[PDB]
């Protein structure tokens, strides 16, 4: 049929309507978020056993 093809074409047009930022910018924001919030990651930096809810 053609209804499926028409729906696919409309979906492709809708996706083509999207604008995209540069890749380096996205990497920059990801790195900035990781660095900003690295201070409160118990799995990353092993928390001392005194405030560890699991002993096991």
């Amino acid at each position: 049929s053609i209804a499926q093809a028409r729906k696919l074409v409309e979906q492709l047009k809708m996706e083509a309507n999207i604008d995209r930022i540069k890749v380096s910018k996205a990497a920059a924001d990801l790195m900035a978020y990781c660095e900003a919030h690295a201070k409160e990651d118990p799995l990353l930096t092993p928390v001392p056993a005194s405030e560890n809810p699991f002993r096991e």
Binding site: L12, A16, K22, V23, A27
Partner: peptide, 21 residues
């Protein structure tokens, strides 16, 4: 039309890339 739109999407994706993460 679908193949042309796919080609345009691929080209735009390639163009928006400037440096690997």
């Amino acid at each position: 039309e679908a193949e042309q739109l796919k080609n345009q999407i691929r080209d735009a994706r390639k163009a928006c890339a400037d440096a690997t993460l």
